[PDB]
């Protein structure tokens, strides 16, 4: 049941200054990235060009590289139209795709946020607000709206493009996707709080506990999940204990990996 | 949609202050000045996208302009010199892409 | 000087047929117009073509536009005196306000009575 999802990031520092660099992503591997120094979309995987044909991928790319500097532009006239309300600096970011469902379903986003605050999305055959943000984008979402060339192409992106791309993917990509790493951990310690390190392991799902024979420590303070270079995951989970109390436990970890085999480590 | 001009032509002194208005009825944000010359096509000076606003279009050295009002949209050529005899468009819109023209005001600088 | 504008120049006798060519650069292209100004007049518009292949009509004023190849011609059937004219090409970048407008310089059409 995956998503997929094309994170775009704007920064308009004065009004001749600006960057936007873009990063793909499905589930939790990168798929593309795009720099603002890159004229052409740069894969990340063998099977990021997906299903796709040499020729469909240019005229896909050569959609993105116009839009790009057409998307630049628009902002900076829509800053002229809004000010003196508005002014720079100006962080606009996107976040589009969708996400698949078995058999023949999916849903398609395309979200937009000002400042770090989500405002706007497209939806339907139109750009419109959200609940929460400022009435003076207003002007800005008519302006959009008028575009009537730009609300066909992306309708088409969300409804038939985007999701047939990421069926493409999904099967160009399964052994990557599926791909099982085993954790490995170790013990440590700073009351005194024990903590059990585990690293290494995909996919995301995993169990991480302290133990005294069979009895599960329900103090256990689980950390999140923090990412290593090598596309697999990292997570940490803490005790606290009394000094010399440390006999007798033992961190159990289950992952899919793994396979019946449980790691325990003892202290 | 009609836009009008004023004046309609014009004849003027180097060092000179001339001042080229447009009125619209049309209640269009937008208004915009543009000047051609025989060679070229019209190429923008200003524009404005509402009461207040004034931009610099692509070729705006030697003009000012002036947005008081929704209706007006002028351009000031402060010290005028030969090089602004020109015929001067002026046109409005909405937010959709038409701009409606005006029916340009001839300009000519003397030494 | 993203708009070409070919021939600059042509006279014709009243009755004849004639093509004016006009290719452009401009990226993106939303739509383009064919525009005619007088000699001492302004710009009367004739037509706009929106579409990646597009044809259009207005009487005798005839239009074609083809968006891979960048390229729009202006028929006129039948020339009367009044064409005596310049033929104005203007590219506009995008479908709403927030573009600019790209104008070709014109072809001077000349009617022979």
């Known amino acids: 049941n995956y998503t997929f999802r094309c994170l775009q990031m704007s920064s308009f520092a004065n009004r001749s200054w600006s960057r936007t660099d873009s990063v793909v992503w499905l589930g939790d591997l990168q798929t593309h990235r795009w720099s603002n120094d890159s004229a052409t979309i740069s894969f990340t995987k063998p099977w990021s060009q997906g299903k796709l044909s040499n020729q469909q991928w240019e005229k896909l790319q050569h959609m993105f590289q116009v839009y790009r500097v057409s998307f630049t532009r628009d902002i900076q006239e829509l800053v002229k139209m809004m000010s003196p309300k508005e002014d720079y600096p100006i962080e606009i970011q996107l976040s589009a795709g969708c996400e698949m469902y078995p058999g023949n379903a999916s849903e398609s986003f395309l979200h937009v946020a000002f400042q770090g605050k989500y405002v706007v999305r497209f939806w339907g055959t139109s750009w419109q607000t959200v609940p929460g943000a400022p009435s003076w984008l207003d002007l800005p979402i008519k302006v959009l709206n008028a575009d009537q060339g730009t609300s066909a192409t992306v309708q088409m992106l969300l409804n038939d493009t985007c999701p047939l791309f990421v069926r493409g993917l999904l099967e160009a990509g399964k052994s990557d996707l599926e791909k099982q790493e085993k954790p490995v951990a170790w013990l440590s310690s700073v009351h005194r709080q024990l903590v059990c390190h585990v690293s290494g392991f995909y996919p995301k799902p995993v169990w991480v506990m302290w133990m005294r024979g069979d009895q599960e420590q329900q103090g256990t303070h689980r950390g999140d999940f923090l990412p290593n270079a090598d596309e697999t995951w990292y997570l940490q989970a803490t005790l606290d204990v009394e000094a010399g109390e440390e006999a007798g436990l033992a961190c159990r970890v289950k992952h899919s990996s793994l396979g019946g085999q449980d790691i325990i480590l003892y202290w | 949609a009609a836009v009008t001009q004023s004046p309609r032509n014009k004849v003027a002194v180097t060092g000179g202050k001339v001042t080229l208005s447009c009125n619209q009825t049309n209640n269009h944000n937008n208004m915009y000045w543009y000047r051609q010359d025989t060679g070229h096509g019209l190429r923008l000076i200003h524009y404005?996208?509402?009461?207040?606003?004034?931009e610099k279009g692509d070729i705006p050295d030697g003009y000012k302009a002036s947005r008081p009002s929704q209706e007006n949209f002028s351009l000031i050529l402060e010290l005028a010199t030969p090089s602004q005899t020109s015929v001067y468009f002026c046109?409005?819109?909405?937010?959709?892409?038409?701009?409606?023209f005006g029916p340009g005001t001839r300009l000519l600088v003397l030494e | 000087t993203q708009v070409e504008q070919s021939p600059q120049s042509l006279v014709v006798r009243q009755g004849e047929n004639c093509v004016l060519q006009c290719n452009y650069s401009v990226t993106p292209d939303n739509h383009l117009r064919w525009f005619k100004q007088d000699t001492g007049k302004g710009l009367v518009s004739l037509t706009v073509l929106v579409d990646q292949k597009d044809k259009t009509s207005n009487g005798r004023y005839s239009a074609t536009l083809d968006k891979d190849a960048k390229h729009s011609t202006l028929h006129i059937t039948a020339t009367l005196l009044d064409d005596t004219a310049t033929y104005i090409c203007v590219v506009g970048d995008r479908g709403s306000a927030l573009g600019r407008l790209h104008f070709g310089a014109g072809t001077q059409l000349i009617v022979i009575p």
């Open positions: 404005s996208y509402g009461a207040g606003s004034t």
């Open positions: 046109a409005s819109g909405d937010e959709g892409y038409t701009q409606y």
